[PDB]
Design an enzyme around this catalytic site. Structure first.
Site, PDB file in Angstrom:
ATOM      1  N   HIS A  51       4.354  -2.141   3.712  1.00 42.12           N
ATOM      2  CA  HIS A  51       4.500  -0.729   3.412  1.00 42.12           C
ATOM      3  C   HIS A  51       5.982  -0.607   3.134  1.00 42.12           C
ATOM      4  CE1 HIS A  51       0.903  -1.054   5.894  1.00 42.12           C
ATOM      5  NE2 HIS A  51       0.445  -0.134   5.060  1.00 42.12           N
ATOM      6  N   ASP A  64       0.919  -1.141   0.000  1.00 47.31           N
ATOM      7  CA  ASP A  64       0.000   0.000   0.000  1.00 47.31           C
ATOM      8  C   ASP A  64       0.956   1.187   0.000  1.00 47.31           C
ATOM      9  OD1 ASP A  64      -2.198  -1.658   0.232  1.00 47.31           O
ATOM     10  OD2 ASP A  64      -2.670  -1.114   2.305  1.00 47.31           O
TER      11      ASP A  64
END
Ligand SMILES: CC(=O)N[C@@H]1[C@@H](O)[C@H](O)[C@@H](CO)O[C@@H]1O
Length: 235
Positions: free
Chosen positions: A199, A50
């Site tokens: 991430h 993400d």
């Protein structure tokens, strides 16, 4: 259709066994062809990321993926695309998949179909301006929040909603725990058909991933992409 907000979550994986979101999520998830796991009958893992903003490690993350010849699926936001056009281009040039994390990263359950359509298409618009290409439509609800209305609507818009089966806190900038923390989570939570959500903003996330892929492969794991997940289940 119900618009009750739902936060994607689940009891973490244990003993390297796939986790289970329960009957209500499963039934709802299945109803709209959304999933959080790939094929659990094989030692396969799918890497997804993400990307809301850049903190300086995505290039290293990309170099690592290239090294191991693994294909990632990066869910980007509008700001990310606008702020990191070249990174979006490398993801593209290097065989990776670009997912949709909405343009402003809002709570879609507070949006109208009209708004949702713009929230999603504007990300594709910018990505295309940069790559001239467009991946299959994959969506990861901003904030991990969704509803039956949101699933239904986005599906009506041609998007495949993709959740995850492995995640940990590798996104808190005020408390970056270092390499070992992430590495151990990636090893401990590993299970067949696992869909990782990582991430690329925390200190050493790239090096932990490197080692994690290195060791997971030694354990007999094969890393596949969300496109591969989709194709193989088609058959
Ligand atoms: C850009 C970004 O960090 N996205 C995160 C997502 O990964 C996470 O699952 C959710 C809840 O923690 O918040 C945001 O949606």
């Amino acid at each position: 259709v119900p618009n009750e907000p739902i936060n994607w979550g689940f009891k973490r994986s244990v003993n390297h066994q796939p986790p289970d979101a329960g009957k209500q999520l499963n039934s709802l998830i299945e109803k709209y062809d959304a999933f959080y796991l790939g094929n659990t009958k094989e030692k396969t893992i799918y890497l997804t990321f993400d990307n809301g903003y850049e903190n300086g490690y995505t290039p290293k993350v990309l170099d690592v993926l290239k090294k191991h010849r693994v294909t990632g699926t990066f869910f980007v936001t509008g700001h990310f695309v606008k702020d990191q056009p070249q990174l979006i281009k490398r993801m593209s040039d290097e065989g990776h998949i670009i997912g949709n994390h909405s343009f402003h990263h809002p709570d879609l359950t507070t949006k109208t179909a009209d708004q949702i359509q713009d929230e999603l298409d504007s990300v594709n618009e910018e990505v295309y301006k940069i790559t001239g290409k467009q991946d299959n439509l994959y969506l990861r609800p901003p904030r991990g929040v969704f509803s039956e209305y949101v699933l239904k609507e986005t599906k009506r818009l041609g998007y495949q909603t993709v959740f995850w089966s492995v995640a940990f806190v590798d996104w808190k900038i005020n408390n970056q725990k270092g390499k070992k923390y992430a590495y151990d989570h990636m090893i401990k939570q590993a299970h067949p058909g696992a869909i990782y959500l990582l991430h690329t903003v925390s200190r050493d996330n790239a090096e932990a991933l490197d080692d994690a892929i290195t060791d997971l492969k030694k354990q007999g794991y094969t890393f596949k992409s969300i496109d591969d997940l989709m194709f193989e289940k088609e058959m």
